């Protein structure tokens, strides 16, 4: 009766925005990225890849409610480096790592199949 549709966990409706950046004024060089229709799958990798950056002073993600589909990633960087640049670099490194992983997986699968 009050069952949400199964596509509501991953589909943006009309007028919904995929990612929104809001600079919080508590501390300098900090931003909050609100990503709609995402879950722990992207939040965890983005948080860890930001934690690999020495210029990132804080990297965290959270789901405010499991019944809603929304990820908040708080990124605070050093003053000579922006949180948006940190987020872009983290996504770029994740994409490069996943492409390398996919190519090496294809190579290893061809090695296992051939012998």
């Amino acid at each position: 009766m009050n069952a949400p549709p199964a596509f509501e966990s991953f589909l943006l409706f009309e007028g919904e925005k995929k990612i929104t950046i809001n600079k919080d004024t508590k501390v300098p060089n900090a931003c909050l990225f609100t990503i709609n229709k995402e879950d722990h799958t992207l939040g965890n990798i983005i948080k860890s890849q930001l934690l690999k950056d020495p210029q990132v002073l804080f990297a965290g993600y959270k789901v405010p409610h499991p019944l809603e589909h929304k990820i908040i990633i708080r990124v605070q960087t050093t003053p000579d480096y922006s949180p948006q640049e940190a987020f872009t670099n983290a996504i770029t490194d994740l994409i490069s790592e996943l492409s390398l992983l996919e190519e090496r997986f294809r190579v290893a699968i061809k090695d296992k199949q051939e012998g």
Binding site: P54, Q55, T78
Partner: protein
């Protein structure tokens, strides 16, 4: 350079009344230079300490040789040469008690400083002449290094 206390301690006992926590062990230590008694909760998992071990213990108001006070905030990107580089086990805490044998009659001859490093407690007691650098609710750093 911000040093409040500096001594060499040797461990007389490790967990006398039994081990209460798996990763935290309570060391009872004595001293040579100032005849000090030390009770110290140490994260024994990342920094194992054996019985009879000797270590240099330094209690400092700051981690910089400049003597400049810090803000108590985490700063992994700080590049100034810290005092922690010369030591193995560095804790940060707040001294929460100064007790003594003072009376309404006589001044304090013995002093006990109780410090809480995030819940890991330390009591450093001995002669009052070496405990003048400890004031209640001030943030101190413990820096111990094992001696071969």
């Amino acid at each position: 350079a911000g040093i409040l206390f500096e001594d060499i301690f040797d461990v007389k006992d490790i967990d006398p009344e039994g081990k209460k926590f798996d990763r935290v062990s309570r060391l009872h230590c004595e001293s040579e230079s100032f005849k000090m008694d030390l009770i110290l909760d140490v994260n024994i998992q990342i920094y194992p300490v054996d019985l009879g071990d000797k270590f240099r213990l330094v209690i400092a108001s700051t981690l910089y040789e400049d003597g400049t006070l810090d803000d108590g905030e985490y700063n992994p990107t700080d590049d100034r040469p810290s005092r922690a580089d010369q030591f193995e086990y560095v804790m940060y805490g707040k001294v929460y008690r100064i007790e003594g044998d003072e009376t309404s009659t006589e001044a304090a001859t013995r002093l006990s400083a109780y410090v809480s490093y995030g819940g890991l407690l330390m009591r450093l007691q001995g002669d009052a002449n070496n405990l003048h650098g400890f004031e209640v609710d001030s943030r101190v750093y413990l820096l111990m290094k094992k001696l071969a």
